[PDB]
DNA sequence: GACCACGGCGCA
DNA sequence: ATTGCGCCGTGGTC
């Protein structure tokens, strides 16, 4: 049923391609064909034949794409199965799992994934027939995104190397002053990045009462939340707590960043997953740039890595409480829309009360705090954790949360309604229509439905503020290009830029207002921005 | 080496 | 009884 023919594929034909490895901007593009008709063209100079390519579409469009515009061509992505699928149920994550349940194997051949893609996008495309919602989030937001996205990685952004190298030594020595004193304490080293060893130092050695289990083992958990319980238990605790920090950041960014530098660029690239989410955000791999720290005094010394080519300047931009602002709009909530109408903050709100300051009182630093509080509420924690989170009565923080939803009337009947239809059609969306199959609404085990029902409730909200984030992306990427400004990283609700020190104003003044202006809801879309030569500077 | 389950923890 | 992610060591394979 498939012939092969020489090379030279018709226009608008399904491409297939092989990687050295999974990363665009390193690997080596080892093959590469295409499917058309009933027939496939293998290209025998792989490189040489990309030249010859209009539009990458397929499977894993995107990722070609980028290694395109990392040898030179403008290669964009076009129609991808993948985004299909992942429109279709977004637990189509992988192009293993879309073979297998649409229509095929994923192999290894470039001429076999180029037949894949074809058969697989034909397949796909009807599934979507009469999903009129879907066809727009697609073509309207996915397959243009993967353009805007390919850019983006292939892009990158600058890093200070000499500055993590620096920071490493300096760290690397208060570790040691930290482990050097838990030992002491101890009486005796012990691996302490080894959970079990600690674990035993802690609960056994030391008489520290346990507070709580892990998961999968009923281990005795040695979380850095059963570590704050036992702070004044014992003086190691701390120690412990700090050690626990440095050592975080120092191996999962200080220390591997550096090291992923592209020689080509000299810039850090990320990979933007636009498949990888059961609620329809992003995801960043390999260098994940989405969870660059911000908290700690060394997380922030860290993030000041992050920064602009000379004469030129990054531009944050990040939706002020975007998803209590799309929860207006989905619960249609009257004191809640008129927060906003209002300009009131909830975040500075709850800062302010449990911190009892002022609101003018409220640095980020407690803002931050109040954040996991409000969403944490909003989401479904426990009292239970609540009292222990703001290490208040279990009382206090079930009025806290009796007032919290008592002042929003509506976000609680928004809730059951969704839940509702969740149950009945088994699949909750968001406000595009952004599909989530949450089967286990009506799992019989109250522990598993309780969870399927909190996973499925927090869908809509996290899922259309994706949309929105991802509609924006789509709308503003044009403009920059036209403008001479890129845009490098995207994390969730917030956006990277790099646009000309001469252009940085104009760019930032532009992009606040196609962010703020993406989809008008019933509530007003307040992005702040900033400006500034790194990271930490702009936000 | 390469990979995996876990417990942990960085961010949204 | 927050949700959604990806990456790091440790232990234990293969
Ligand atoms: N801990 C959490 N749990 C659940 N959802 C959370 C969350 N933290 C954030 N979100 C979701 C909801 C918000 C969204 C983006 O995170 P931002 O930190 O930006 O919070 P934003 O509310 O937009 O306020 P801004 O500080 O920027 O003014 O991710
Ligand atoms: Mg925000
Ligand atoms: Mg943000």
Request: hydrophobic fraction near 40%; glycine fraction near 6%; proline fraction near 6%.
């Amino acid at each position: 049923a498939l012939e092969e023919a020489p090379w030279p594929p018709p226009e608008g034909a399904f491409v297939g391609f092989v990687l050295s490895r999974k990363e665009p901007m390193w690997a080596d593009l080892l093959a590469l064909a295409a499917a058309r008709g009933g027939r496939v063209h293998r290209a025998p100079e792989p490189y040489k034949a990309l030249r010859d390519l209009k539009e990458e579409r397929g499977l894993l469009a995107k990722d070609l794409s980028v290694l395109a515009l990392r040898e030179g061509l403008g290669l964009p992505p076009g129609d991808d199965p993948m985004l299909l699928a992942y429109l279709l149920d977004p637990s189509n994550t992988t192009p293993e799992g879309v073979a297998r349940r649409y229509g095929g194997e994923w192999t290894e051949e470039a001429g076999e994934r180029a037949a894949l893609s074809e058969r697989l996008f034909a397949n796909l495309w009807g599934r979507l027939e009469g999903e009129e919602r879907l066809l727009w989030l697609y073509r309207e937001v996915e397959r243009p995104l993967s353009a805007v996205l390919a850019h983006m990685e292939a892009t990158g952004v600058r890093l200070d190397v000499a500055y993590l190298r620096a920071l490493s030594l300096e760290v690397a020595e208060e570790i040691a002053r930290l482990e050097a004193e838990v030992f002491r304490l101890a009486g005796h080293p012990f691996n302490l990045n080894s959970r079990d060893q600690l674990e035993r130092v802690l609960f056994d050695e030391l008489g520290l009462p346990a507070i709580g289990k892990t998961e999968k083992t009923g281990k005795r958990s040695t979380s850095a939340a059963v570590l704050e319980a036992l702070r004044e238990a014992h003086p190691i605790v701390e120690k412990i707590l700090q050690y626990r920090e440095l050592t975080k950041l120092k191996s999962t960014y200080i220390d591997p960043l550096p090291d992923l530098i592209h020689p080509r660029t000299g810039r850090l690239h990320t990979r933007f997953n636009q498949t990888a989410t059961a609620t329809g955000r992003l995801s960043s791999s390999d260098p994940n740039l989405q969870n660059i720290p911000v908290r700690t005094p060394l997380g922030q010394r860290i993030r000041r890595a992050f920064i602009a080519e000379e004469g030129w300047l990054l531009v944050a931009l990040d939706y002020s409480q975007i998803e209590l602002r799309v929860l207006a709009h989905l619960s249609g909530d009257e004191n809640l829309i008129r927060v906003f109408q209002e300009g009131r903050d909830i975040h500075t709100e709850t800062a302010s009360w449990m911190f009892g300051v002022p609101r003018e009182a409220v640095d980020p630093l407690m803002r931050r705090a109040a954040k996991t509080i409000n969403f944490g509420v909003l989401y479904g924690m426990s009292a239970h954790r609540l009292s222990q989170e703001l290490a208040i009565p279990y009382e206090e923080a079930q009025a806290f949360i009796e007032r919290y939803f008592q002042s929003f009337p509506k976000v609680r009947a928004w809730i059951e309604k969704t839940l509702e239809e969740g149950r009945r059609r088994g699949y909750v969306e968001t406000l595009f229509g952004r599909r989530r199959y949450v089967p286990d609404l009506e799992a019989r085990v109250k522990s598993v439905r309780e969870a399927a029902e909190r996973m499925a409730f927090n869908m809509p909200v996290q899922g259309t503020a994706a949309d929105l984030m991802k509609l924006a992306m789509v709308k503003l990427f044009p403009r920059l290009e036209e403008m001479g400004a890129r845009m490098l990283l995207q994390v969730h609700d917030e956006l990277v830029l790099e646009a000309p020190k001469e252009r940085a104003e104009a760019v930032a003044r532009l992009a606040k207002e196609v962010m703020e202006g993406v989809y008008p809801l019933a509530v007003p879309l307040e992005v702040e921005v900033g400006i500034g030569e790194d990271w930490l500077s702009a936000k």
